[PDB]
Design an enzyme around this catalytic site. Structure first.
Site, PDB file in Angstrom:
ATOM      1  CG  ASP A   9      34.624 -34.382 104.648  1.00  6.69           C
ATOM      2  OD1 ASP A   9      34.329 -33.176 104.440  1.00  6.69           O
ATOM      3  OD2 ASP A   9      35.513 -34.736 105.442  1.00  6.69           O
ATOM      4  CE1 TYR A  31      36.163 -37.552 101.824  1.00  6.59           C
ATOM      5  CE2 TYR A  31      38.113 -36.512 102.735  1.00  6.59           C
ATOM      6  CZ  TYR A  31      36.910 -37.156 102.908  1.00  6.59           C
ATOM      7  OH  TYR A  31      36.473 -37.397 104.191  1.00  6.59           O
ATOM      8  CG  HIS A  77      37.619 -32.785 102.580  1.00  8.32           C
ATOM      9  ND1 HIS A  77      38.844 -32.737 101.946  1.00  8.32           N
ATOM     10  CD2 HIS A  77      37.852 -33.302 103.811  1.00  8.32           C
ATOM     11  CE1 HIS A  77      39.772 -33.230 102.750  1.00  8.32           C
ATOM     12  NE2 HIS A  77      39.195 -33.578 103.886  1.00  8.32           N
ATOM     13  CG  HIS A 100      31.499 -33.001 108.265  1.00  6.06           C
ATOM     14  ND1 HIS A 100      31.398 -34.178 107.545  1.00  6.06           N
ATOM     15  CD2 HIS A 100      32.824 -32.745 108.385  1.00  6.06           C
ATOM     16  CE1 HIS A 100      32.610 -34.604 107.236  1.00  6.06           C
ATOM     17  NE2 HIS A 100      33.490 -33.751 107.729  1.00  6.06           N
ATOM     18  CG  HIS A 159      38.908 -34.152 113.067  1.00 10.31           C
ATOM     19  ND1 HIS A 159      39.659 -33.103 112.578  1.00 10.31           N
ATOM     20  CD2 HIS A 159      38.842 -35.067 112.076  1.00 10.31           C
ATOM     21  CE1 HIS A 159      40.009 -33.360 111.333  1.00 10.31           C
ATOM     22  NE2 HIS A 159      39.523 -34.543 111.000  1.00 10.31           N
ATOM     23  CG  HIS A 208      35.272 -33.987 110.883  1.00 15.19           C
ATOM     24  ND1 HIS A 208      35.948 -33.466 109.797  1.00 15.19           N
ATOM     25  CD2 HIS A 208      35.771 -33.355 111.975  1.00 15.19           C
ATOM     26  CE1 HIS A 208      36.832 -32.576 110.216  1.00 15.19           C
ATOM     27  NE2 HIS A 208      36.744 -32.489 111.535  1.00 15.19           N
ATOM     28  CG  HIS A 257      38.426 -40.318 107.878  1.00 15.69           C
ATOM     29  ND1 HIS A 257      39.571 -39.739 107.375  1.00 15.69           N
ATOM     30  CD2 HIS A 257      37.396 -39.556 107.441  1.00 15.69           C
ATOM     31  CE1 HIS A 257      39.245 -38.684 106.648  1.00 15.69           C
ATOM     32  NE2 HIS A 257      37.932 -38.552 106.672  1.00 15.69           N
TER      33      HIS A 257
HETATM   34 FE   LIG Z   1      36.499 -36.778 105.997  1.00 14.30          FE
HETATM   35 ZN   LIG Z   2      35.685 -33.841 107.556  1.00 19.21          ZN
END
Ligand SMILES: [Fe+3]
Ligand SMILES: [Zn+2]
Ligand SMILES: *[C@@H]1O[C@H](CO)[C@@H](O[C@@H]2O[C@H](CO)[C@@H](O)[C@H](O)[C@H]2NC(C)=O)[C@H](O[C@@H]2O[C@@H](C)[C@@H](O)[C@@H](O)[C@@H]2O)[C@H]1NC(C)=O
Ligand SMILES: *[C@@H]1O[C@H](CO)[C@@H](O[C@@H]2O[C@H](CO)[C@@H](O)[C@H](O)[C@H]2NC(C)=O)[C@H](O[C@@H]2O[C@@H](C)[C@@H](O)[C@@H](O)[C@@H]2O)[C@H]1NC(C)=O
Ligand SMILES: *[C@@H]1O[C@H](CO)[C@@H](O[C@@H]2O[C@H](CO)[C@@H](O)[C@H](O)[C@H]2NC(C)=O)[C@H](O[C@@H]2O[C@@H](C)[C@@H](O)[C@@H](O)[C@@H]2O)[C@H]1NC(C)=O
Ligand SMILES: *[C@@H]1O[C@H](CO)[C@@H](O[C@@H]2O[C@H](CO)[C@@H](O)[C@H](O)[C@H]2NC(C)=O)[C@H](O[C@@H]2O[C@@H](C)[C@@H](O)[C@@H](O)[C@@H]2O)[C@H]1NC(C)=O
Ligand SMILES: *[C@@H]1O[C@H](CO)[C@@H](O[C@@H]2O[C@H](CO)[C@@H](O)[C@H](O)[C@H]2NC(C)=O)[C@H](O[C@@H]2O[C@@H](C)[C@@H](O)[C@@H](O)[C@@H]2O)[C@H]1NC(C)=O
Ligand SMILES: *[C@@H]1O[C@H](CO)[C@@H](O)[C@H](O[C@@H]2O[C@@H](C)[C@@H](O)[C@@H](O)[C@@H]2O)[C@H]1NC(C)=O
Ligand SMILES: *[C@@H]1O[C@H](CO)[C@@H](O)[C@H](O[C@@H]2O[C@@H](C)[C@@H](O)[C@@H](O)[C@@H]2O)[C@H]1NC(C)=O
Ligand SMILES: *[C@@H]1O[C@H](CO)[C@@H](O)[C@H](O)[C@H]1NC(C)=O
Ligand SMILES: *[C@@H]1O[C@H](CO)[C@@H](O)[C@H](O)[C@H]1NC(C)=O
Ligand SMILES: *[C@@H]1O[C@H](CO)[C@@H](O)[C@H](O)[C@H]1NC(C)=O
Ligand SMILES: *[C@@H]1O[C@H](CO)[C@@H](O)[C@H](O)[C@H]1NC(C)=O
Ligand SMILES: *[C@@H]1O[C@H](CO)[C@@H](O)[C@H](O)[C@H]1NC(C)=O
Ligand SMILES: *[C@@H]1O[C@H](CO)[C@@H](O)[C@H](O)[C@H]1NC(C)=O
Ligand SMILES: *[C@@H]1O[C@H](CO)[C@@H](O)[C@H](O)[C@H]1NC(C)=O
Ligand SMILES: [Fe+3]
Ligand SMILES: [Fe+3]
Ligand SMILES: [Fe+3]
Ligand code: NA
Ligand code: NA
Ligand code: NA
Ligand SMILES: [Zn+2]
Ligand SMILES: [Zn+2]
Ligand SMILES: [Zn+2]
Lengths: 424, 425, 424, 423
Positions: free
Chosen positions: A158, A161, A196, A280, A290, A317, A319
C-alpha cells in the site's frame, strides 16, 4: 476530512532544470546484493536510461544502460520511466550514481551491504501502508532520524493510495515518487504489493492488475527464478527475505505456490540465519478492520512457515500495530475440533506494521478481549526497526509518531529460530 | 497406464483433405441464443466460416470467426478455429457445417428453451474425464442415459496431457477427437482444473492455462468478467456460475470482485436454480486432496449461504461424494466454532470427479464418515442434474459398473428459494 | 512564417466536456455504401459508438468502432476514434452523432449514387493544404464554389506539422479542427505525401507515416491491399486508384503487385472515369522537385497508357500545371528516344499542389514551356473534376485571387475508353 | 526440376539429438571485430549460447543470443538461434561451438585484418545461388578456387523456396544445410533479392521478406540503419554498401535518407575500395529484367559517380555481364541527353547472378552489344574480387564448365580514388 498533503507541498516540489530526473528510487537488483536497480522519471522528453556510477574510493566512472517505458491509465499518460540495473558492485562500498546524463544531471549515493554471511549485522526499517498524508511525512521523518539508523526498508505494501482519487488520479503516483525520494534514492526499499496496487477498475476499462505499480516499481524477481514481479526473494547481509503477493493466486499448483515451496528448500540458515517473510494481508490480526482476511493464505502457507521455522512475518493492511506470540494453528482437520492457536516455538512471530500514515486514518476498533495469540497491540501511527546483531539475536522496536525519534513504545528481542530458539 | 493407445477408434482422424476435427460447441452468450463453434484443421489454415441453418427455417447463413495457433515446448499446434453463431431461435434444432473450403462436416445442436421459471432441463455432470478406457465407458454411459442429457457441466481436468513428457500436447488433440461425439452436438460448460494450469518453468512454459485457453473458449465477456477462467451463463431455469480454483480470489482481486457483483445480479424469480461449478471441492472427506478447498471456502462459503446456492459441483477428487446441507461460517479464530453444522440455507456439495482420469480411483476415505457427508463411494461414473420446475430438481449418480439406467444414488433437491424445506435423505 | 496562430478561430476547440473534435469522414468500402467516421476526444477516452440515421427512414442505429492512442517523441495524442458505418443506401442524406456519453455533436453527409456508366459527380481537387492563411482561403473558395464538390480527392501533404520542432504533433490537432468544417460533411480521399513520412531517427521515431496513419484511416482491405498507403475506391462513375510515392514500388513489391492486379480489375463499363492519385508528379516542368517523379514513371507510366487512364492528379509542387496527353515510354537506353510525344491514349497529368502549404508558392519554372506542358501557373487554388457522363468531364482550376466562381483554367476531358476524341 | 532431390548428400541432417544444422555466420559489427553466429535446432528449443576461443589464447568464452520461430502458411519452422560474438581479435582464427545442451558441433573462422589503406583481401561474388545441381557446382568451384575466397558478397536470391507450392519452406532448411559447408567457416554478406520478398497474399502471407529476415540477420544498426535490408560494413580495405532493390527508395524515405548520409562517412584513405551490392542491375543488356533497374538508377546513379564508387555488383539476371565505366546522368527530360557516356568517375557494373538458381540460364541478349557493355556471357559461375592494395584489385570470372583455375573473364580494377586510369 482529507489529510493528504496538498499538491504544492514542499515534499512534492519538482527538481528544477530541463528534463531533470525525478521520482528517483533504488532497490536491490540481484539475489545477494552486488546489483542495484536504479529507477526514475523524466517529464519533458524521453531522455537517456544511462546511469553513471563510481565507488567513492576507486573512482573509475562506469556507465550502465537500461530501459525506458510509458503507460496510460484512463485519461492519464505517464512520464518516461527509466529502469537500469548496475551490476558487479563491491560489497560494503559507498557508490555515487548519476541520472539525467543528456540534460539535467542529478547525483545520489548508496552503500552496498556486506557480503551475505552468518553473523553479518544489518538494520532494516519496517514501513507499511505509507500514503502521502501528513502522518506519512512524520513517519518518514521519524525513520530518517532514527538513532538505530536504518539501511534498507522492507515495505509491506500500500504505497501511494492514488486509487482513492477520481479515476485513481495517477498524478498521485508522481507526487509519491518525488516525496519518498529523499529516502529511497539513497537506500533500497524492498517492495511488497498491497491491495491499493491492484487498481482493478473495469468501470474505466483498466482491468490489468498492478499495472501502474508494476511499471513504476521493478524488482529482481528473475534472480530467484520467479516468473512474476509480485513474489520473489532476496538475500541481504544475514537475512533471507521472501516476498509474497496476497492478491495473486496461491492455490496448490499455481505459480506462486510452486515457487514458494521450492524457494523454502533453498534457504540456508548457516549462511543467512534470519528468515523473513513479507506479505500485505496479515495472517494473525485481532483488529476488526480486515479481521480474518488472511485466513485463505494462512491455510496454504502457515504450516510451511512453521516447518521451516520462519523468524518473523511482517504484514501491513491493518492501519495499526500488532505483535503476536509465537503460535501456530495448523492441527485443524475439519471434524477434530483443533482450531485454537497454541504456543509453538517453531513458529514465526507475526507483526502488523501498516501504520505509517496512509491517508490519515488509524484503525482503533480491536477485537475484545485481546486474544492469547496477541502479545501487544496499539492503534498509533509509526514504523518498525528490525536490528540484526548476529546469528542469535535481533532487536525489534516500534517507534510512535507522537513520541521522540529515539523512543520505542514497544521492543522485543528476537531469538533466532535456528541458532537460538529460546522462548521470547 | 490405462490411457487409450493412439490408434484407438475414438482417436481416428476424420478423413478428407483438411477435414475439421476436434469439433466442439459451448454456449456463446448469457441467455442461450449464441453458440461458440470450435474445431481444428491440421493440413492448412482453412476457413473460419460456419454455415448454419435451422431444421425448419432452412435459410442458410454464414458466420465468420477467427483462427489461432500456439506452441508448447517442441509441439506446434494445428489451426484452431473459434466462431460464434448469434441470434438463434430458442428450442430450435440447427445444423451447422465446418470446413467450407475443402472437406465439409455437418453436425447439429438444439438451442435451449427461453429462460423461465419452470423450464425443465437435464444437465450432465462430468469431471476429471481424461482419456483412459474408464473415460470412454463414462462417456458411453452418459450418451446412452435414459434421462437424455442436453448440456454437460464439466468441472475440470480435461485431457491430462500434462502427465505426458513435455505435456505432449498431441494428447490434447486426441482428447478433442474422443470427446467430439458428444460436444459437437451439445454444449459442454468448461471449468478449469489443475491439469489445465500447465505451469512448466523447466521447459520455459510459464503462462498458466495456455493450451486449454487456446483450445476451449467461453463467453466470459457476456457476464462482464475480465477472464475466461470465471464467468456466468443462464440456460433454461438455471443460473450457472463458474469459478477458478487456481486463480486469485483474495479480497479485491478480479475474480473476487466479479463474483460478489455477480451474486447480486442473480434473480431467483427468473432463474430459480443457482449452480456453482469449481474444480477443488469445499467439502471433501476423501484423503486425496483433503482440505485443499479450505482456502476458497474461507472466502466464498458464507456468500453461498447468504445467496442460498442450490448446489456446488466440483471435481478433483477421483470419486463421488454428496454432502448434507451444512455451513462452517461461524469460526472466529478463538471461539472454537469450527465444526460444520446443519444449515437449510446452505447448498449441497457434490464431488463428481470420477469420470475416469487416467484409470485411478480415489478409495482412501477418512473414517468414520463425518456428519457433513451424506453419501460417498469410490467408483467411476457421472451425474445428472434434472430440473423439473422451480421447486424440484432430481440428481442421480450412475456407476460405470451398473447398467446405464441404474441410479446408485439419487436425491430430490428442494429449491432453496421456492421450496425452502429440508430435503435431506 | 505564414501559418495561422494557435488562437485562430479555425482552431477553436468545440465547447463541452470531452466534446468530439477533429471530426472527419471518408468512404469506408469499395462502392460507396460505407463511411469511416473519425474523431478525437481529449478529456477522456469516451465512446467509439456512432449514432446515425437516414433522412428517408429516420431509424436511429448504432455502430461501434475502436479507440487508439499514439506517442511521438514527447507528445501524447488524445483518444482517436475510427468507426465504420455500413449498409448505407445510395443517394441518401444521413445524419450521424459522435460523443454519445458526454457532449454529443451531429453532422450529415450524402451517400453517392450507385456506381454506373453515366452517373454524374463533382470531385474537388486539393493538394498540399497546410494551415497558413492561404490554406484557409483555398478551403473557403472550395466550399463557396458554385460547382459544389461532393468529395475531395486529396493528393497529399496535410498539416505540415513536421516543420515544427519535434514535428509538434499539436499541429496535427489544429489541422484536424480546421479542416472539420468540410471533411466532417463530405468524404476526403487521402493520399500520403512526403510531409506524412515523419522519419525522424534523431528523436527515435522511425515508423514511417505513423501520425498520419493513426489519425487518417482508409478502406484499404476493401480492394485487397495490404497497406493503408495504396488502395482503390469506386464512387459514382469513377474508379479511383490511390498510390504511395514514398512506399516501395519495385517489381514484386506489395504496391507494384497490388497495382498490376488492380488495373486488370477496372471495369470501365461500370466506372468509365479512371483516376490515379499520387503525391509526386510524373510530369512536372517546375524547378522545385524537378524530375523527382522519374522513378515511378519508369515503373507505372506504360501501365497508365495501356489501361487508358483518364487523368493523374498529383501535388508536391506548390503551383498548378496541366500537361498535354503525352507518353515517354519508347526509351531503350541506347535508342535516343527519351522525348515525350503526344499520345492520345495517355492520361492528362495535373499538378494541383497549390492549396496553400505554409504560405509559399513555387514560382521557378523551366523556360520555355515544354511541349508536354499545356498550361501552368504559380498561384494558390484548387481543382474541380466535374463528371457529366461516360464521355464528358469538365475540369476547372480556381485561383485564390479570383472570385469564387471564376475559372482561370478549364478543359473538357473526353473519356479515353468511351470517347477517345482529341481533346487538345 | 533440376533442383537437387531432398535425399541428396548436401541436404543430409547432422546426426544426434537436436544437433545444430543450417549453421551460418556473417560479420557482426561495422569494422570486423564481431560475428553473428546462426543455426537451427529441430528437436527442441535448445541453448542459444556459443562457446568460442582463439587458437592462440585457448581461453574459452561464452556468448548468449536469442531464439525465435515463425510460421508460413501450414509450415512451422524449427528453433532459430542468432548470437553475436564481439571484441574478437583481428586476423585471428577462432573455434566456436553451438549445440551446448545436447549435440555440440564445432566450426572455425578467421577474423579479417584491421581496416587499412593497403590491406589485401579476397572476396567471392555469388548471386542467385539456388539449390540445383548447377548451384552445387558453383559452390564447389568457389571452394576450390586457388585464390582462396575469404568472404562471399552475396547479391540476392538465396533458396528459391518461393517456387515450390506454398513456398514450401522446407526448401529454406535444405538450402541452409547445403550452404553450411561454406558459410559456417566464412561470412557471407547478405543482400535481399526478389525471391526473398515472399509476398503471398493468396495464402495470407503479406509480411515482406519474412522467412529470409528470420533466418538471416545482418548488423544493420552498426551503420545506423533502421532496417536489415540496407546497411554497410567495412572489412580490410573495403567499404561495402548493401541496398534493397525491393524496399522504398524515393526521396525522403528511410533507405534514401540512409544512403545519402552513409556516402558522406566513406573514408577512402581508410578503406579505398568502395563497393555497392544490390539485387537488380542498373546496367543490364539481357532481355530478361531489361531496364528493371531504371527506377533505382534515377535516384542513385549520380550519387555513385559523385562518390566515385569502384564497382557495383548485382544479380537477378541469370548470366554474367561486365560494363564499361559509363554514366547516364545528364538527362533533363527535354535536353535529349539519354545515352550513356564513358565516365572515369563512374563504377563498373557487374551482373553476377549466374550461380545456378533452379537450373536455367538467361541467354537472350539485346543486340547488338551496347557500347556500355564490355563483356557478357550466359554461363554458370561465380566471381572473385581480389584486392592487392589501394590501387589494384583483380576481378576474375570462373565458369562451371571450365577448370577451377580458369578465368574466362578477368580485369584489373584501378581504384577511382587512388589510381583512376582507364581500365
Ligand atoms: Fe492500507
Ligand atoms: Zn491494504
Ligand atoms: C517537448 O519538447 C520540446 C523540446 O524541448 C519542449 O519545448 C521546449 O520547452 C522548454 C521548456 O522547458 C523551452 O525552454 C524551450 O524553448 C522549448 N524548445 C522548443 C524548441 O520549443 C516542449 O515544451 C513545450 O513548449 C514549451 C514552450 C513549454 O511551454 C512547455 O511547457 C511545453 O510543454 C515539450 N513538450 C511537452 C508536452 O513535453
Ligand atoms: C549477539 O548479540 C547479542 C546482543 O548484542 C549479544 O547479547 C548481549 O551480549 C552482551 C555481551 O557483549 C551482554 O552484555 C548483553 O546483556 C547481551 N544482550 C542480551 C539481550 O542478551 C550476544 O552475546 C552473546 O550472548 C550473551 C547471552 C552472552 O553469553 C555473551 O557473552 C555472548 O557474547 C551475541 N551473541 C554472539 C554469539 O555474538
Ligand atoms: C414439479 O416437479 C415435481 C417433480 O417432478 C412434481 O412432483 C411430482 O409430481 C408427480 C405428479 O405430477 C408425482 O407422481 C411425483 O411423485 C412427484 N414427485 C415428487 C418427487 O414429489 C411437482 O408436482 C407437484 O408436487 C407433487 C408432490 C404432487 O403434489 C403434484 O401433484 C404437484 O403438482 C411439480 N410441480 C408442479 C406445480 O407441477
Ligand atoms: C455528356 O455530357 C456532355 C456535356 O454536358 C453533353 O454535351 C452537351 O450537350 C448539350 C445538349 O444536351 C449541348 O447543348 C452542349 O453544348 C454539350 N456540351 C459539350 C461540351 O459538348 C453530352 O451530350 C451529347 O453530346 C453533345 C456533343 C451533343 O451531341 C448532345 O446532343 C449529345 O446528347 C452528354 N452525352 C449524352 C449522351 O447525353
Ligand atoms: C598494387 O598491386 C599491383 C598488382 O600486384 C602492383 O602492380 C604490380 O607490380 C609488380 C611489381 O611492382 C609488377 O611485376 C606487376 O606487373 C604489377 N601488376 C600490374 C597489374 O601492373 C602495384 O605495384 C605498383 O604499381 C604498378 C602500376 C607499378 O608502378 C609497380 O612498379 C608499383 O610497385 C601495387 N601498388 C602498390 C602501391 O603497392
Ligand atoms: C483445398 O481447397 C482448394 C479450394 O477449394 C482447392 O483448390 C484445393 O485443391 C488443390 O489445390 C489447387 C490449387 C489445385 O492444385 C487442385 O488441383 C488441388 O487438388 C484443395 N486441396 C486439396 C488437397 O484438395
Ligand atoms: C538433452 O539435454 C538435456 C539437458 O542436459 C537433457 O535433460 C536431455 O536428457 C534427456 O532428458 C532428461 C530429462 C533425462 O531423462 C535424460 O536421461 C534424457 O536423455 C537431453 N536429451 C537427450 C535426448 O539426450
Ligand atoms: C515533511 O517533513 C519534513 C521533514 O521533517 C519537513 O522538512 C517538511 O516541511 C514536511 N512537509 C510537510 C508538507 O509536512
Ligand atoms: C501443406 O499443404 C499442402 C497442400 O496445400 C500439402 O500437400 C502439404 O503436405 C502440407 N504440408 C504440411 C507440413 O502440412
Ligand atoms: C469406446 O466406446 C464406444 C461405445 O461405447 C465403442 O464403440 C468403442 O469401441 C470404445 N473404444 C475404446 C474402448 O477404445
Ligand atoms: C478562415 O476563413 C473563414 C471563412 O472565410 C473565416 O470565417 C475565418 O475568420 C478565417 N480565419 C482565419 C484565421 O483566416
Ligand atoms: C481526467 O478526467 C477528469 C474528469 O473525470 C478531469 O477532471 C481531469 O482534469 C482529466 N485529466 C486529464 C489529464 O485528462
Ligand atoms: C555436391 O558437390 C560436392 C563437392 O563437389 C560433392 O561431394 C557432392 O556429392 C555433390 N552433391 C550433389 C547432390 O551433387
Ligand atoms: C520433443 O522432444 C522429445 C524429447 O524431449 C522427443 O522425443 C520428441 O519426439 C519431440 N517431438 C517433436 C514433435 O519434435
Ligand atoms: Fe483429476
Ligand atoms: Fe507540399
Ligand atoms: Fe534469380
Ligand atoms: Na484477501
Ligand atoms: Na486444490
Ligand atoms: Na521521389
Ligand atoms: Zn484436479
Ligand atoms: Zn510534398
Ligand atoms: Zn532476382
Amino acid at each position: 476530512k482529507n489529510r493528504d498533503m496538498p499538491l504544492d507541498s514542499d515534499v512534492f516540489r519538482v527538481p528544477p532544470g530541463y528534463n531533470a530526473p525525478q521520482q528517483v528510487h533504488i532497490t536491490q537488483g540481484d539475489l545477494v546484493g552486488r546489483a542495484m536497480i536504479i529507477s526514475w522519471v523524466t517529464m519533458d522528453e524521453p531522455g537517456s536510461s544511462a546511469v553513471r556510477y563510481w565507488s567513492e574510493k576507486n573512482g573509475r566512472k562506469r556507465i550502465a544502460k537500461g530501459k525506458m517505458s510509458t503507460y496510460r491509465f484512463f485519461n492519464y499518460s505517464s512520464g518516461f520511466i527509466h529502469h537500469t540495473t548496475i551490476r558487479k558492485l563491491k560489497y560494503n562500498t559507498k557508490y555515487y550514481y548519476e541520472v539525467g546524463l543528456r540534460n539535467t544531471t542529478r547525483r545520489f549515493s548508496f552503500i552496498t551491504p556486506p557480503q551475505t554471511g552468518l553473523d553479518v549485522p544489518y538494520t532494516f526499517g519496517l514501513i507499511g501502508d505509507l500514503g502521502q498524508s501528513f502522518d506519512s511525512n512524520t513517519t518518514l521523518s521519524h525513520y530518517e532520524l532514527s538513532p538505530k539508523k536504518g539501511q534498507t526498508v522492507l515495505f509491506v505494501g500500500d504505497l501511494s493510495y492514488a486509487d482513492r482519487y477520481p479515476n485513481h488520479d495517477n498524478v498521485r503516483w508522481d507526487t509519491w515518487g518525488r516525496f519518498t525520494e529523499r529516502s529511497v534514492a539513497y537506500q533500497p526499499w524492498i517492495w511488497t504489493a498491497g491491495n491499493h496496487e491492484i487498481e482493478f477498475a473495469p468501470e474505466i476499462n483498466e482491468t490489468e492488475p498492478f499495472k501502474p505499480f508494476s511499471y513504476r516499481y521493478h524488482v529482481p524477481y528473475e534472480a530467484s527464478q520467479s516468473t512474476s514481479p509480485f513474489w520473489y526473494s532476496i538475500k541481504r547481509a544475514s537475512a533471507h527475505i521472501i516476498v509474497l503477493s496476497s492478491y495473486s493466486a496461491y492455490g496448490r499448483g499455481t505459480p506462486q505456490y510452486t515457487w514458494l515451496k521450492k524457494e523454502l528448500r533453498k534457504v540456508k540458515r548457516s549462511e543467512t540465519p534470519w528468515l523473513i517473510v513479507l506479505m500485505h494481508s496479515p495472517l494473525y490480526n485481532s483488529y476488526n478492520h480486515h479481521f480474518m482476511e488472511g485466513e485463505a493464505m494462512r491455510t496454504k502457507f502457515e504450516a510451511w512457515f512453521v516447518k521451516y521455522k520462519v523468524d518473523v512475518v511482517f504484514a501491513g493492511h491493518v492501519h495499526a500495530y500488532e505483535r503476536s506470540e509465537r503460535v501456530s494453528n495448523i492441527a485443524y482437520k475439519i471434524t477434530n475440533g483443533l482450531c485454537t492457536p497454541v504456543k509453538d516455538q517453531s513458529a514465526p512471530v507475526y507483526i502488523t506494521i501498516g501504520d505509517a500514515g496512509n491517508y490519515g486514518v488509524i484503525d482503533s476498533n480491536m477485537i475484545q478481549p485481546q486474544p492469547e495469540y496477541s502479545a501487544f497491540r496499539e492503534a498509533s501511527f509509526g514504523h518498525g526497526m528490525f536490528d540484526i546483531k548476529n546469528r542469535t539475536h535481533a532487536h525489534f522496536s516500534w517507534n510512535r509518531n507522537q513520541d521522540g525519534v529515539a523512543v520505542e513504545a514497544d521492543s522485543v528481542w528476537f531469538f533466532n529460530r535456528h541458532w537460538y530458539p529460546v522462548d521470547d
